[PDB]
């Protein structure tokens, strides 16, 4: 079965071209005579431009194939203009005209100058790899993918040794070892069918690594989670039920080790955990299961009275990095409680606890979020004392942050 037809250009487009040129009152047989001649020349060239596609070993007809197919038929590749003399440009392709159907048809002549030029890509290089080792295809990233008998483990001993080396490198004794192991996790195609043992090693590790608050052990495991996530080959949402309570624990937990000093890293432990938490709510999303569940736990962490301030700071960060609308709808009715907590830490003399440090970090983070939440939905008028209607927390400094954001927008 083949119902192949002969499609030509419409004749009602050929009369528009003729009467817009000075040739009026053309007959239909005169007009049909134009649209079978030019529809043959399009068919003659597209059959001839398919020769250059096959010879160049491509499956996509590029724009340059018609430039060589035209030159082959002794017609100039120039499309925009036609030179009768033909001497200024002799069968020289000018690359066509970058024109659109939905274009503006008028631009400003300094808009084209002030835009940044695109980056010239890398030059052609020759890398070698292995498709087959004595018949077997390796799983390198340059490749695509009555007694019962004594069973064998589903991992090979090269795979089991690889797992042991990657896990002993990912506990961060040496930094270059970590970084390669993290890139190896980030792009090994055959890292599926080893992923249960990696997820179990992560999950089990954080839970026996918060018994004593060992920050590096945790910062390395969170980097291992981040390296597991951006791998495109492996299927992760079968294992995310172990991954998510591990990261929530990094963000919402108390620190058993020295309270100050590494709190700077602790904020990053909560920064890396809140980054991977909102990346996990970005992926793996179905109706009302993952994002709303962690949002509900973060909000009942917030509205809980008389919290640990480490847990408070971590949950504040976690609810803060959830996107545009989430701080637009959630952080709004709670400024008074935040201010009262700050006032209590300030009044009570107790300085040797971690409450004061937790309070300062929470207030700074909340004030930065409130700044764009404001820069985003209102004009920058009355930036001096109108914020005193919102208890006067960030005030003019918040206004200065909004002004810096406006300057960044102007630079963009």
């Amino acid at each position: 079965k083949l119902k192949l037809s002969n499609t030509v250009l419409p004749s009602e487009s050929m009369k528009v071209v003729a009467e817009s040129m000075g040739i009026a009152q053309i007959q239909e047989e005169t007009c049909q005579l134009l649209t079978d001649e030019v529809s043959y020349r399009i068919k003659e060239i597209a059959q001839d431009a398919l020769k250059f596609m096959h010879m160049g070993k491509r499956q996509k007809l590029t724009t340059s194939d018609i430039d060589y197919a035209l030159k082959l038929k002794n017609v100039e590749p120039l499309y925009g203009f036609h030179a009768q003399e033909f001497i200024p440009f002799r069968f020289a392709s000018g690359g066509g005209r970058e024109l659109y159907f939905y274009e503006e048809k008028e631009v400003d002549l300094s808009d084209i100058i002030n835009t940044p030029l695109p980056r010239v890509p890398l030059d052609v290089c020759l890398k070698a790899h292995w498709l087959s080792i004595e018949g077997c295809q390796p799983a390198i990233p340059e490749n695509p993918p009555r007694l019962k008998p004594r069973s064998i483990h589903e991992l090979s001993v090269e795979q089991q040794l690889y797992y042991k080396e990657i896990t002993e490198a990912c506990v961060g004794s040496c930094e270059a070892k970590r970084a390669e192991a993290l890139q190896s996790i980030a792009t090994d195609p055959g890292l599926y069918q080893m992923l249960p043992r990696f997820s179990t090693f992560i999950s089990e590790g954080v839970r026996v690594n918060v018994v004593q608050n060992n920050l590096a052990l945790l910062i390395y495991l969170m980097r291992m989670v981040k390296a597991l996530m951006d791998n495109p080959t492996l299927y992760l949402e079968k294992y995310v039920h172990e991954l998510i309570p591990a990261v929530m624990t990094c963000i919402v937990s108390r620190q058993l080790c020295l309270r100050p000093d590494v709190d700077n890293h602790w904020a990053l432990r909560d920064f890396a955990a809140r980054l991977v938490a909102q990346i996990c709510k970005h992926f793996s999303t179905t109706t009302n299961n993952i994002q709303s569940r962690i949002t509900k736990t973060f909000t009942k962490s917030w509205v809980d009275e008389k919290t640990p301030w480490t847990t408070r700071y971590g949950s504040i960060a976690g609810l803060a990095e959830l996107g545009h609308d989430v701080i637009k709808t959630l952080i709004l009715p709670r400024l008074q409680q935040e201010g009262e907590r700050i006032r209590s830490v300030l009044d009570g003399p107790v300085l040797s606890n971690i409450d004061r440090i937790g309070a300062d970090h929470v207030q700074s983070l909340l004030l930065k979020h409130c700044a764009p939440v404001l820069a985003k939905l209102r004009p920058p008028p009355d930036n001096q004392d109108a914020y005193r209607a919102e208890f006067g927390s960030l005030g003019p400094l918040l206004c200065s942050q909004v002004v810096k954001a406006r300057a960044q927008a102007a630079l963009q």
Partner: peptide, 25 residues
């Protein structure tokens, strides 16, 4: 549609919130 593979993934069938360790000791 309740036999869709996702329904049976244990993220959508497990109270994994209970695992998060808060103030452990």
């Amino acid at each position: 549609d309740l036999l869709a593979d996702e329904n049976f993934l244990m993220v959508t069938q497990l109270h994994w919130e209970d695992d998060i360790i808060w103030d452990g000791e």
